[PDB]
């Protein structure tokens, strides 16, 4: 039962590694928003998300991360 | 602490970087496919082992790998501008009935829109095309943009109001490209609907050529052209179209096919004008002293909404006063005087058709 | 459950390294790790591992223990730089298991819901691919004695990805690659024969032995069903057998009909050709 | 190594099996404007070789103009009935891009993909856009596409000789098309748009109602004459708008009220007494 | 069925024998119909054994081979004379 | 992988070039690594870089690669070979006997265009071997299935 | 072809136009997608070669 | 659930003329109703009724998993009319049509349930129909696991197991060899006749593949032998 603050010494070392990688805001960009789950053709889970960039481009990637589909519509 | 540890371990997930898009161009062997980035190279890459070709296709937005590039995942459609051009809402529905005039204006566009909806088979028990869309204009009198903005809600089914202003992109102003963009989806979520207020500045003529901006814009015509010129059948989207006049807009426009149907607003009647301040009178309580015709024979060819403000600015006007509630006395002298300073402005407003 | 197991050169140098670590100071026993596995699918993939020290008395031949201290940070040390690592299970270098390796897996099935043990060999002699792979399950048996657990035997697979395909083939050094259709098909038949008939061989001599010597059970249980198993086919002819041998002939009709096609073709074009370019040096030169 | 080649990029082509078509048929008043496409199509396809024997060079001239009155992509889909080539929709502002090289990449590989699926043929809808005269190095990138318009006119003419392309041409105003683009073997052959008459009315009249219900009441002829001292139009979809006019009922068979009622509808107007002392 | 009398083949096709056996014979010489018919016990048989697929390349190669050697007596013997 | 270790620039008054037993050194700088590489050496140098046996366990992780072409167990993916043996790899030889017609059609045509364009186009056009080693899975085919005799007989 | 296969990424390689030289041997060049660069002889084709 | 009452309007339409597959989903839609019944006669009935059709439907590769969802219900096997159809349809072997007859032929006396019977049996020539439909299907699973089993037959050897004459094993065989699920082979003046078998390349797959696909099991001998070994060795 007492293992709770050595959670709580876990969760402040690795949201240590979330103040070093957030990961930083840095550079500006623009999202696209999509929800997907993968079905084959085994049968995994997850989700995916769209980004705008500064630099024009654009990035197909696991939901973020940090904050969620929480908000928002991009 | 454990919901903690669980946002810990949903970012021990996070650093796994993020793939970048792709559109699936076509395909040469199994190992090869042919694919290009958003910025421009083309590349051939190796797929994952679980998908089928059948799950890919030519021309088929996907992504790849960051460093392999090999083709993981994909999502067949996606855009930022389609569903933030639904969103803007009319209350009414009853705004139909609070329109006041006009019936053939009212209700052959539900004639023109509707029954081609719920029934195309009465277009082909007769045999009639039906009409992909519809052209509002004027100004004399008003009520393009509302009846147009009180239909969107009334009719319902779906519909996808387009603005009319951001197209222009600023750099390489290729938007046309976006109205297909937006026709896919139009395809896509069909049936849909349209309404466009100013197709006129989008309507230029390049009748004596001249410096740049006129070329993107007759450049972003050739497409709205072409795409209503297919190769293509839009009926499921119905384009309703008004604006200032109906005259700049060159006659490739001005023909069926991309304009349906003449429809339009005149200065309404004083019988109708009667009906349309009854809907200003409605949401406005005063003293029970009220004669309509007073202010209907008294104020003479205006329009609704030059009615029914400057009735509501009369009943400000006489608040000013402070009294709480006013009889016509006040508005058959305020709508009365204001509005003949607001038609001193109704010069020159009388324009080609 | 496990079907078969992916064992990287890398793992395997693991063990071995840390037979050298602990092989210089001696001087019994066996090097005993912590594996760390990475699991994507039904069949097992290993990529790193490390070892910690251990050491088991004799008097007490079924006494043992490991550091759980080490096996927990430095989990978080590599889990840190590597978030796709994670223990699949320990390992040792045998050569053959004594009956105390069962409780290790059964210390560590908190750490991992089912832990695969995997035996290796520092030293290679026989009779093939190294190491060997068991899975922590529990069979009971057919006789309904009381759960029981005798680790079945999981195929392992030596295999690579990229950067550790790169470091071994550059560090091979050794013999011809392949080379493909001549020596590698026959060597092949040498080595998977003769060893085939050594195995079954020493296994044939075993089986004979446990006989002999060792009993009981021992004999029972499966004995008698293998053995039968080896009894299903003799196999020979009359009948469809025969029917075969001249259809098997009658299949290497084409490929050795095709054989006199290439070598006519290969000689018509090499020999037409290097006698014209012969002939015309010759008399022009000369 | 190159490509195979190719599998190539954009489009492409088909739009026939896998639609859509559209019967040409139906509309017989431009005959006379079919009278080129007749002999500049079918016989410059499937013969190169009466070209060794008649002394004459194919042309790959052809224009179109006038609309509305439209015809033409209409036109095009026509033929895409019987020859089987390709057939690519394409206008000047659709293939505008973010950067400046993928014109070649489109219109470079359009040439390499159409002689090298040849027997093939492509159609620009509305040339016209990509012919305006400008400078700013903004459109410097524009420029380098009308470069490219120029390096697709400079790699067209390797289509000479024999197999194959038919270049077919349409705009609603001539202003900014440069001599180049009109150049001697580009453009030998100029196609207007003939205004439809008694003729094509009448067979404008006829080719509507032969579908949609028509009636005894119906004579036509009264119309080959007082609607057609203006029009001209457009005609088509007035022959549409009387029958748009049944939908206002309830109806079965057009009325001639209707039939008027599409007259009045559009258009006018006289003007004026302006032109009464003339 | 390959193998089939012909009396009971004809009671399927609702057929007399004599132009069952000469249009059935007639299918075999259209070469569409693999098989033969037996007279003697009235009896139909369908066999087969299609490609000829290697000695099409056999034959391909060696009879342009001819010509092959026919095209090296050009060069080998104008070195002689 | 590479190597580069970083030269004292307080050896500026001194002169920057050693080392004395230039062996492994003038061995080193080939291929002369690039440009952009030996930009750095202004400033930087390689080191050399040998694997020290160990043979043993060389031997070991050699053989351990080696199961990729020799075979996975050394019995295992030529007992494989008995597996499929010839199966189903007479499908692929259909392949390589449609290999045979497409490739040997047009390596009959190759001697006439010899002596119409008199003769070697430099060339030849590789159409040659190939199919031998069709041949040498005939040796596959011959081999194995004589190990029949051996499996069915006791 | 490896060699040259090694050589030709830690680089590149493009194409210039030489819009006029120097006295200090250099060369005015254009990098044709970007802006330009100045650079030297290139000792095997002189300055007056081209 | 008027909308699932209707479906017992409609199997008169799919069951009147020409479908007897069309039934096979849908009297399991229709058999949804009893399940929120509260009712007796008409839920066992429903049983009975849905679980006797799978003569009525020709054999196919959905006939089977769908009497497997029905199949091993408790409520089911209370009736000994559903052993014998159960029997017959597991393990086949053989069983004298007359015996058939007594258990169908009892359904008419048999309950309680009257609504097979209706089906079935109520019209004379749907209930006809369904007889020679009946000799079909039993025929059709004579020949199924027969003709997998030739190789060769003889000719009386059929008329003899089949129950019938000669004639209608031809006729049985005739409209079973054009529905193309056996190859035959058939020739009564000789009385050799024979079904199956491949009938492949053969030369490559048959047998190169098949032997070496055993092979598969004899270069694996000693692998999974000296495992077992072990496994008993160890745990005694
Ligand atoms: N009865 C009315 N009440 C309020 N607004 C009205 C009424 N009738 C017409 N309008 C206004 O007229 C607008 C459309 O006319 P528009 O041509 O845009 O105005 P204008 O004639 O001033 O250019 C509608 O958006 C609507 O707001
Ligand atoms: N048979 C026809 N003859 C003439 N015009 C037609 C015919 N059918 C449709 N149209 C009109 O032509 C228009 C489309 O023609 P199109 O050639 O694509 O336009 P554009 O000539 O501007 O490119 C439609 O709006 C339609 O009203």
Same mark, same amino acid.
């Not at chain 3, 290679?124 to 035997?153: Q, R």
């Not at chain 3, 990805?161 to 083939?169: C, D, F, Q, T």
């Not at chain 5, 009398?5 to 609702?14: G, N, P, R, V």
């Not at chain 7, 493009?14 to 990098?31: F, T």
């Given at each position: 039962?007492?293992?709770l603050?050595?959670?709580?010494?876990?969760?402040?070392?690795?949201?240590?590694?979330?103040?070093?990688?957030?990961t930083?805001?840095?550079?500006?960009?623009?999202?696209?928003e999509?929800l997907?789950?993968?079905?084959?053709?085994?049968?995994?889970?997850?989700?995916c998300?769209?980004?705008?960039?500064s630099?024009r481009?654009?990035?197909?990637?696991?939901?973020?991360?940090?904050?969620?589909?929480?908000?928002?519509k991009? | 602490?454990?919901?903690?540890?669980?946002?810990?371990n949903?970012?021990?997930?996070?650093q796994?970087?993020?793939?970048?898009?792709?559109?699936?161009?076509?395909?040469?062997?199994?190992?090869?496919?042919?694919?290009?980035?958003?910025?421009?190279?083309?590349?051939?890459?190796?797929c994952?082992?679980?998908?089928?070709?059948?799950?890919?296709?030519?021309?088929?937005?996907?992504?790849?790998?960051?460093?392999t590039?090999?083709?993981?995942?994909?999502?067949?459609?996606?855009?930022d501008?389609?569903?933030?051009?639904?969103?803007?809402?009319?209350?009414?529905?009853?705004?139909?009935?609070?329109?006041?005039?006009?019936?053939?204006?009212?209700?052959?566009?539900?004639?023109?829109?509707?029954?081609?909806?719920?029934?195309?088979?009465?277009?082909?028990?007769?045999?009639?095309?039906?009409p992909?869309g519809?052209?509002?204009?004027?100004?004399?009198?008003?009520?393009?943009?509302?009846?147009?903005?009180?239909?969107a809600?009334?009719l319902?089914?779906?519909?996808?109001?387009?603005?009319s202003?951001?197209?222009?992109?600023?750099?390489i102003?290729?938007?046309?490209?976006?109205?297909?963009?937006?026709?896919?989806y139009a395809?896509?979520?069909?049936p849909?609907?349209?309404?466009?207020?100013?197709?006129?500045?989008?309507?230029?003529?390049?009748?004596?050529?001249?410096?740049?901006?006129?070329?993107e814009?007759?450049?972003?015509?050739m497409?709205?052209?072409?795409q209503?010129?297919?190769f293509?059948?839009?009926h499921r989207?119905?384009?309703?179209?008004?604006?200032?006049?109906?005259?700049?807009?060159?006659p490739?426009?001005?023909?069926?096919?991309?304009l349906?149907?003449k429809?339009?607003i005149?200065?309404?009647?004083?019988?109708?004008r009667?009906?349309?301040?009854?809907?200003?009178?409605?949401?406005?309580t005063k003293?029970?002293?009220?004669?309509?015709?007073?202010?209907?024979?008294?104020?003479?060819?205006?329009?609704?909404?030059?009615?029914?403000n400057?009735?509501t600015?009369?009943?400000?006007?006489?608040?000013?006063?402070?009294?709480?509630?006013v009889?016509?006395e006040?508005?058959?002298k305020?709508?009365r005087?204001?509005a003949?300073?607001?038609?001193?402005?109704?010069?020159?407003?009388?324009?080609?058709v | 459950?496990?079907?078969?197991?992916?064992?990287?050169?890398?793992?395997?140098?693991?063990?071995?390294?840390?037979?050298?670590?602990?092989?210089k100071?001696?001087?019994?026993?066996?090097?005993?790790?912590?594996?760390?596995?990475?699991?994507?699918?039904?069949?097992?993939?290993?990529?790193?591992s490390?070892?910690?020290?251990f050491?088991?008395?004799?008097?007490?031949?079924?006494?043992?223990?490991?550091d759980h201290?080490?096996?927990?940070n430095?989990?978080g040390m590599?889990?840190?730089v590597?978030?796709?690592?994670?223990?699949?299970?320990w390992?040792?270098?045998?050569?053959?298991?004594?009956?105390?390796?069962?409780?290790?897996?059964?210390?560590?099935?908190?750490?991992?819901?089912?832990?695969?043990?995997?035996?290796?060999?520092?030293?290679?002699?026989?009779?093939?691919?190294?190491?060997?792979?068991?899975?922590?399950?529990?069979e009971?048996?057919?006789?309904? !004695?009381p !759960?029981?657990?005798?680790?079945?035997?999981?195929?392992?697979?030596?295999?690579?990805?990229?950067?550790?395909?790169?470091?071994?083939?550059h560090?091979?050094?050794?013999?011809?690659? !392949?080379?493909?259709?001549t020596?590698?098909?026959?060597?092949?038949?040498?080595?998977?024969?003769?060893?085939?008939?050594?195995?079954?061989?020493?296994?044939?001599?075993?089986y004979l032995?446990?006989?002999?010597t060792?009993?009981?059970?021992?004999?029972?249980?499966?004995?008698?069903?293998?053995?039968?198993?080896?009894?299903?086919?003799?196999?020979?002819?009359?009948?469809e057998?025969?029917?075969?041998?001249?259809?098997?002939?009658?299949?290497?009709?084409?490929?050795?009909?095709?054989?006199?096609?290439?070598?006519?073709?290969?000689?018509?074009?090499?020999?037409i050709?290097?006698?014209?370019?012969?002939?015309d040096?010759?008399?022009?030169?000369? | 190594?190159?490509?195979?080649?190719?599998?190539?990029?954009?489009?492409?082509?088909?739009?026939?099996? $896998?639609?859509?078509?559209?019967?040409?048929?139906?509309? &017989?008043?431009?005959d006379?404007?079919?009278?080129?496409?007749?002999?500049?199509?079918?016989?410059?396809?499937?013969?190169?070789?009466?070209?060794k024997?008649?002394?004459?060079?194919?042309?790959?001239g052809?224009?179109?103009?006038?609309?509305?009155?439209?015809?033409?992509?209409?036109?095009?889909?026509?033929?895409?009935?019987?020859?089987?080539?390709?057939?690519?929709?394409?206008?000047?502002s659709?293939?505008?891009?973010?950067?400046? &090289?993928?014109?070649?990449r489109?219109?470079?590989?359009?040439?390499?993909?159409?002689?090298?699926?040849?027997?093939?043929?492509?159609?620009?809808?509305?040339?016209?856009?990509?012919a305006?005269?400008?400078?700013?190095?903004?459109?410097?990138?524009?420029?380098?596409? $009308?470069?490219?318009?120029?390096?697709?006119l400079?790699?067209?003419?390797?289509?000479?000789?024999?197999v194959?392309?038919?270049?077919?041409?349409?705009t609603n105003?001539?202003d900014?098309?440069?001599?180049?683009?009109?150049?001697p073997?580009?453009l030998?052959?100029?196609?207007?748009?003939?205004?439809?008459?008694?003729?094509?009315?009448?067979?404008?009249?006829?080719?509507?109602?032969?579908?949609?219900?028509?009636?005894?009441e119906?004579?036509?002829?009264?119309?080959?004459?007082?609607?057609?001292?203006?029009?001209?139009?457009?005609?088509?979809?007035?022959?549409?708008?009387?029958?748009?006019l049944?939908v206002?009922?309830?109806?079965?068979?057009?009325?001639?009220?209707?039939?008027?009622?599409?007259?009045?509808?559009?258009?006018?107007?006289?003007?004026?007494?302006?032109?009464?002392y003339? | 069925?390959?193998?089939?009398?012909?009396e009971?083949?004809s009671?399927?096709?609702?057929?007399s024998?004599?132009?069952?056996?000469?249009?059935?014979?007639?299918?075999?010489?259209?070469?569409?119909?693999?098989?033969?018919?037996?007279?003697?016990?009235?009896?139909?048989?369908?066999?087969?054994?299609?490609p000829?697929?290697?000695?099409?390349?056999?034959?391909?190669? @060696?009879?342009? #081979?001819?010509?092959?050697?026919?095209?090296?007596?050009? #060069?080998?013997?104008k070195?002689? @004379? | 992988?590479?190597?580069?270790?970083?030269?004292?620039?307080?050896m500026?008054?001194?002169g920057?070039?050693?080392?004395?037993?230039?062996?492994?050194?003038?061995?080193?700088?080939?291929?002369?690594?690039?440009?952009?590489?030996?930009?750095?050496?202004?400033?930087?140098?390689?080191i050399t870089?040998?694997?020290?046996?160990n043979?043993?366990?060389?031997?070991?992780?050699?053989?351990?690669?080696?199961?990729?072409w020799?075979?996975?167990?050394?019995?295992?993916?030529?007992?494989?070979?008995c597996?499929?043996?010839?199966?189903?790899?007479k499908?692929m030889?259909?392949?390589?006997?449609?290999?045979?017609?497409?490739?040997?059609?047009?390596?009959?045509?190759?001697?006439?265009?010899?002596?119409?364009?008199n003769?070697?186009?430099?060339?030849?056009?590789?159409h040659?071997?190939?199919?031998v080693?069709?041949?040498?899975?005939?040796n596959?085919?011959?081999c194995?299935?004589?190990?029949?005799?051996?499996?069915?007989?006791? | 072809?490896?060699?040259?296969?090694?050589?030709?990424?830690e680089?590149?390689?493009?194409?210039?136009?030489?819009v006029?030289?120097?006295? %200090?041997? %250099?060369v005015?060049? %254009?990098?044709?997608?970007?802006? %330009?660069?100045?650079?030297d002889?290139?000792?095997?084709?002189?300055?007056?070669?081209? | 659930?008027?909308?699932?009452?209707?479906?017992?309007? =409609?199997?008169?339409?799919?069951?009147?003329?020409?479908?007897?597959?069309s039934?096979?989903?849908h009297?399991?839609?229709?058999?949804?109703?009893?399940?929120?019944?509260?009712?007796?006669?008409?839920?066992?009935?429903?049983?009975?009724?849905?679980?006797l059709?799978?003569?009525?439907?020709?054999?196919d590769?959905?006939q089977?998993?769908?009497?497997?969802?029905? *199949?091993?219900?408790?409520?089911?096997?209370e009736?000994?009319?559903?052993?014998?159809?159960?029997?017959?349809?597991?393990? =086949?072997?053989?069983?004298?049509? *007359?015996?058939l007859?007594?258990?169908?032929?009892?359904?008419?006396?048999?309950?309680?349930?009257?609504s097979?019977?209706?089906?079935?049996?109520?019209?004379?020539?749907?209930?006809?129909?369904?007889?020679?439909?009946?000799?079909?299907?039993?025929?059709?699973?004579?020949?199924?696991?027969?003709?997998?089993?030739?190789?060769?037959?003889?000719?009386?050897?059929?008329?003899?197991?089949?129950?019938?004459?000669?004639?209608?094993?031809?006729?049985?065989?005739?409209?079973?060899?054009?529905?193309?699920?056996?190859?035959?082979?058939?020739?009564?003046?000789?009385?050799?006749?024979?079904?199956?078998?491949?009938?492949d390349?053969?030369?490559?797959?048959?047998?190169? *593949?098949?032997?070496?696909?055993?092979?598969? *099991?004899?270069?694996?001998?000693?692998?999974?032998?000296?495992?077992?070994?072990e496994?008993?060795?160890?745990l005694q």
């Amino acid at each position: 039962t007492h293992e709770l603050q050595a959670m709580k010494d876990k969760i402040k070392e690795n949201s240590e590694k979330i103040k070093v990688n957030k990961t930083l805001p840095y550079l500006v960009s623009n999202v696209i928003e999509l929800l997907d789950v993968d079905p084959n053709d085994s049968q995994r889970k997850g989700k995916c998300a769209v980004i705008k960039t500064s630099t024009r481009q654009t990035y197909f990637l696991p939901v973020i991360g940090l904050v969620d589909a929480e908000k928002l519509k991009p | 602490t454990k919901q903690y540890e669980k946002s810990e371990n949903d970012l021990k997930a996070l650093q796994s970087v993020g793939q970048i898009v792709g559109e699936v161009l076509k395909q040469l062997t199994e190992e090869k496919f042919i694919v290009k980035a958003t910025n421009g190279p083309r590349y051939v890459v190796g797929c994952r082992r679980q998908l089928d070709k059948s799950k890919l296709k030519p021309g088929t937005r996907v992504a790849l790998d960051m460093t392999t590039l090999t083709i993981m995942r994909y999502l067949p459609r996606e855009v930022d501008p389609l569903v933030y051009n639904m969103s803007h809402e009319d209350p009414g529905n009853v705004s139909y009935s609070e329109i006041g005039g006009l019936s053939e204006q009212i209700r052959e566009l539900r004639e023109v829109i509707e029954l081609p909806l719920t029934n195309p088979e009465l277009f082909q028990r007769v045999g009639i095309i039906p009409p992909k869309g519809c052209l509002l204009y004027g100004p004399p009198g008003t009520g393009k943009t509302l009846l147009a903005r009180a239909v969107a809600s009334q009719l319902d089914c779906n519909f996808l109001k387009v603005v009319s202003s951001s197209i222009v992109d600023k750099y390489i102003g290729e938007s046309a490209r976006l109205i297909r963009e937006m026709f896919n989806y139009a395809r896509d979520h069909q049936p849909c609907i349209i309404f466009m207020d100013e197709i006129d500045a989008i309507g230029g003529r390049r009748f004596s050529e001249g410096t740049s901006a006129d070329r993107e814009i007759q450049r972003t015509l050739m497409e709205l052209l072409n795409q209503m010129d297919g190769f293509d059948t839009l009926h499921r989207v119905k384009m309703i179209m008004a604006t200032n006049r109906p005259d700049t807009l060159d006659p490739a426009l001005l023909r069926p096919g991309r304009l349906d149907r003449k429809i339009h607003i005149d200065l309404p009647n004083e019988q109708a004008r009667l009906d349309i301040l009854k809907i200003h009178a409605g949401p406005i309580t005063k003293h029970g002293e009220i004669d309509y015709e007073a202010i209907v024979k008294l104020s003479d060819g205006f329009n609704g909404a030059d009615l029914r403000n400057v009735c509501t600015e009369a009943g400000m006007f006489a608040i000013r006063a402070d009294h709480d509630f006013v009889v016509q006395e006040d508005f058959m002298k305020a709508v009365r005087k204001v509005a003949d300073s607001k038609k001193l402005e109704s010069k020159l407003d009388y324009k080609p058709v | 459950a496990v079907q078969k197991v992916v064992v990287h050169p890398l793992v395997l140098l693991s063990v071995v390294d840390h037979f050298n670590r602990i092989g210089k100071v001696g001087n019994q026993k066996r090097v005993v790790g912590v594996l760390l596995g990475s699991w994507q699918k039904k069949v097992l993939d290993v990529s790193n591992s490390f070892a910690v020290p251990f050491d088991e008395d004799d008097k007490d031949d079924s006494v043992w223990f490991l550091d759980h201290d080490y096996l927990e940070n430095m989990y978080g040390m590599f889990k840190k730089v590597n978030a796709r690592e994670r223990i699949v299970g320990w390992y040792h270098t045998g050569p053959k298991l004594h009956k105390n390796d069962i409780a290790i897996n059964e210390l560590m099935k908190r750490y991992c819901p089912n832990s695969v043990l995997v035996i290796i060999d520092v030293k290679p002699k026989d009779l093939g691919l190294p190491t060997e792979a068991y899975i922590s399950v529990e069979e009971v048996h057919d006789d309904g !004695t009381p !759960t029981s657990k005798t680790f079945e035997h999981v195929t392992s697979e030596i295999g690579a990805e990229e950067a550790e395909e790169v470091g071994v083939e550059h560090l091979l050094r050794d013999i011809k690659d !392949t080379t493909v259709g001549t020596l590698s098909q026959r060597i092949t038949n040498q080595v998977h024969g003769l060893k085939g008939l050594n195995s079954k061989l020493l296994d044939i001599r075993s089986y004979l032995e446990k006989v002999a010597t060792g009993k009981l059970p021992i004999n029972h249980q499966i004995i008698y069903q293998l053995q039968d198993v080896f009894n299903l086919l003799p196999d020979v002819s009359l009948q469809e057998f025969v029917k075969a041998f001249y259809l098997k002939t009658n299949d290497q009709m084409v490929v050795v009909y095709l054989a006199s096609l290439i070598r006519s073709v290969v000689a018509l074009h090499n020999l037409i050709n290097n006698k014209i370019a012969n002939r015309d040096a010759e008399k022009k030169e000369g | 190594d190159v490509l195979p080649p190719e599998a190539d990029s954009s489009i492409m082509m088909l739009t026939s099996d $896998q639609k859509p078509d559209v019967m040409y048929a139906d509309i &017989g008043g431009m005959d006379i404007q079919k009278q080129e496409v007749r002999e500049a199509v079918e016989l410059p396809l499937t013969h190169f070789e009466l070209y060794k024997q008649i002394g004459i060079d194919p042309p790959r001239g052809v224009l179109m103009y006038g609309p509305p009155g439209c015809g033409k992509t209409m036109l095009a889909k026509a033929v895409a009935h019987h020859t089987t080539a390709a057939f690519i929709r394409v206008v000047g502002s659709e293939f505008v891009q973010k950067y400046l &090289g993928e014109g070649p990449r489109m219109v470079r590989d359009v040439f390499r993909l159409a002689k090298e699926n040849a027997p093939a043929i492509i159609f620009i809808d509305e040339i016209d856009a990509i012919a305006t005269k400008r400078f700013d190095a903004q459109t410097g990138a524009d420029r380098e596409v $009308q470069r490219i318009l120029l390096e697709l006119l400079n790699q067209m003419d390797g289509f000479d000789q024999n197999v194959n392309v038919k270049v077919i041409m349409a705009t609603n105003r001539a202003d900014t098309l440069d001599p180049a683009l009109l150049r001697p073997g580009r453009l030998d052959r100029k196609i207007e748009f003939p205004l439809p008459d008694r003729r094509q009315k009448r067979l404008i009249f006829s080719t509507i109602t032969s579908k949609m219900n028509l009636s005894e009441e119906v004579d036509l002829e009264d119309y080959v004459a007082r609607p057609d001292k203006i029009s001209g139009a457009d005609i088509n979809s007035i022959c549409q708008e009387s029958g748009m006019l049944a939908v206002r009922e309830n109806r079965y068979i057009v009325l001639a009220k209707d039939f008027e009622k599409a007259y009045k509808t559009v258009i006018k107007k006289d003007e004026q007494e302006h032109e009464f002392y003339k | 069925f390959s193998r089939v009398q012909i009396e009971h083949i004809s009671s399927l096709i609702k057929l007399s024998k004599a132009d069952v056996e000469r249009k059935l014979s007639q299918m075999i010489l259209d070469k569409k119909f693999h098989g033969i018919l037996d007279q003697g016990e009235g009896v139909l048989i369908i066999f087969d054994e299609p490609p000829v697929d290697k000695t099409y390349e056999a034959a391909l190669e @060696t009879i342009q #081979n001819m010509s092959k050697v026919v095209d090296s007596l050009y #060069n080998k013997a104008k070195k002689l @004379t | 992988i590479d190597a580069f270790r970083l030269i004292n620039a307080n050896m500026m008054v001194l002169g920057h070039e050693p080392r004395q037993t230039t062996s492994n050194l003038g061995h080193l700088n080939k291929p002369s690594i690039q440009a952009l590489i030996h930009g750095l050496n202004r400033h930087y140098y390689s080191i050399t870089i040998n694997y020290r046996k160990n043979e043993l366990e060389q031997k070991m992780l050699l053989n351990l690669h080696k199961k990729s072409w020799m075979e996975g167990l050394t019995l295992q993916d030529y007992s494989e070979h008995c597996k499929h043996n010839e199966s189903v790899v007479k499908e692929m030889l259909e392949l390589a006997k449609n290999y045979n017609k497409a490739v040997e059609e047009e390596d009959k045509m190759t001697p006439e265009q010899l002596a119409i364009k008199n003769v070697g186009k430099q060339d030849p056009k590789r159409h040659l071997e190939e199919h031998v080693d069709v041949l040498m899975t005939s040796n596959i085919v011959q081999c194995l299935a004589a190990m029949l005799d051996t499996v069915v007989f006791k | 072809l490896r060699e040259e296969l090694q050589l030709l990424q830690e680089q590149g390689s493009y194409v210039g136009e030489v819009v006029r030289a120097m006295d %200090k041997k %250099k060369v005015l060049v %254009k990098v044709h997608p970007e802006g %330009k660069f100045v650079v030297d002889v290139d000792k095997n084709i002189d300055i007056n070669d081209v | 659930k008027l909308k699932l009452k209707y479906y017992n309007l =409609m199997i008169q339409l799919d069951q009147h003329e020409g479908s007897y597959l069309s039934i096979c989903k849908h009297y399991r839609a229709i058999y949804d109703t009893p399940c929120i019944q509260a009712e007796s006669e008409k839920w066992q009935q429903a049983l009975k009724s849905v679980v006797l059709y799978v003569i009525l439907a020709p054999f196919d590769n959905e006939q089977s998993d769908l009497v497997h969802r029905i *199949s091993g219900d408790k409520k089911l096997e209370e009736i000994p009319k559903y052993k014998d159809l159960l029997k017959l349809f597991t393990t =086949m072997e053989l069983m004298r049509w *007359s015996t058939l007859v007594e258990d169908y032929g009892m359904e008419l006396r048999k309950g309680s349930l009257e609504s097979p019977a209706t089906d079935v049996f109520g019209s004379t020539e749907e209930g006809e129909k369904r007889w020679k439909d009946l000799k079909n299907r039993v025929v059709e699973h004579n020949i199924r696991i027969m003709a997998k089993y030739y190789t060769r037959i003889t000719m009386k050897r059929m008329a003899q197991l089949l129950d019938l004459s000669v004639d209608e094993s031809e006729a049985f065989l005739s409209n079973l060899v054009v529905n193309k699920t056996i190859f035959a082979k058939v020739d009564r003046l000789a009385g050799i006749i024979n079904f199956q078998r491949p009938k492949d390349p053969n030369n490559l797959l048959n047998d190169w *593949s098949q032997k070496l696909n055993s092979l598969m *099991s004899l270069v694996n001998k000693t692998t999974h032998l000296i495992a077992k070994e072990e496994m008993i060795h160890n745990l005694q």
